[PDB]
Amino acid sequence: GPLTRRASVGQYTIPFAFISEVVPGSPSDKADIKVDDKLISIGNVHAANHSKLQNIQMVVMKNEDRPLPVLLLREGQILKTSLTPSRNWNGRGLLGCRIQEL
């Protein structure tokens, strides 16, 4: 994550899962998610409240066809993207990636 800087004039950070596979053409692929990304948040689900991942399947089903915010750690950088869970692609389920706990 970012190094500490002095406060200046002018957010989840804790990884909890990782992405081990991404099906080409899936919603996860379209969201620019990559193998080995670490998941920091998906919708309202983050390290403190994912309930051993069960809250993810619920959140993605409820958000079918609607964009969800995703925070991930890639190569040490926190990236913000969005994923639209959907069935309309050539594969199984709403996501097309495998998400496992760290």
Residue numbers in the entry: 115 to 124, 129 to 220
Question: Can you list sentences taken from the study reporting this PDB entry?
Answer:
The 26S proteasome is a 2.5 MDa protease dedicated to the degradation of ubiquitinated proteins in eukaryotes. The RP-specific chaperones Nas6, Nas2, Hsm3 and Rpn14 are important for the assembly of a hetero-hexameric AAA-ATPase ring formed by the subunits Rpt1 to Rpt6. One of these, Nas2, binds to the proteasomal AAA-ATPase subunit Rpt5. The PDZ domain of Nas2 binds to the C-terminal tail of Rpt5; however, it does not require the C-terminus of Rpt5 for binding.
Since no crystals were obtained, we created two truncated forms of Nas2 with the goal of minimizing the sequence around the PDZ domain. Nas2LND produced well diffracting crystals after two months, enabling us to determine a structure comprised of amino acids Gln129–Leu220 in the asymmetric unit. Nas2LND adopts a fold consisting of five β-sheets and two α-helices commonly found amongst PDZ-domain structures. N-terminal residues from cloning that spanned Gly115–Gly124 could be traced in the electron-density maps. However, residues between Gly124 and Gly129 were disordered and could not be modeled. Following refinement, recurring electron density was observed in two regions. The first was modeled as a disordered PEG 400 fragment obtained from the cryoprotectant. Nas2 lacks the GLGF motif commonly found just prior to β-strand 2 in PDZ domains. The absence is not surprising as the Nas2 structure shows that β-strand 5, instead of the common β-strand 2, contributes to the putative peptide-binding groove, causing a different loop arrangement. The reported Nas2 structure will provide the basis for further insights regarding the structure and function of Nas2 in proteasome assembly, as it will facilitate molecular docking of the tail of Rpt5 as well as enabling the design of Nas2 mutants based on the putative binding region.
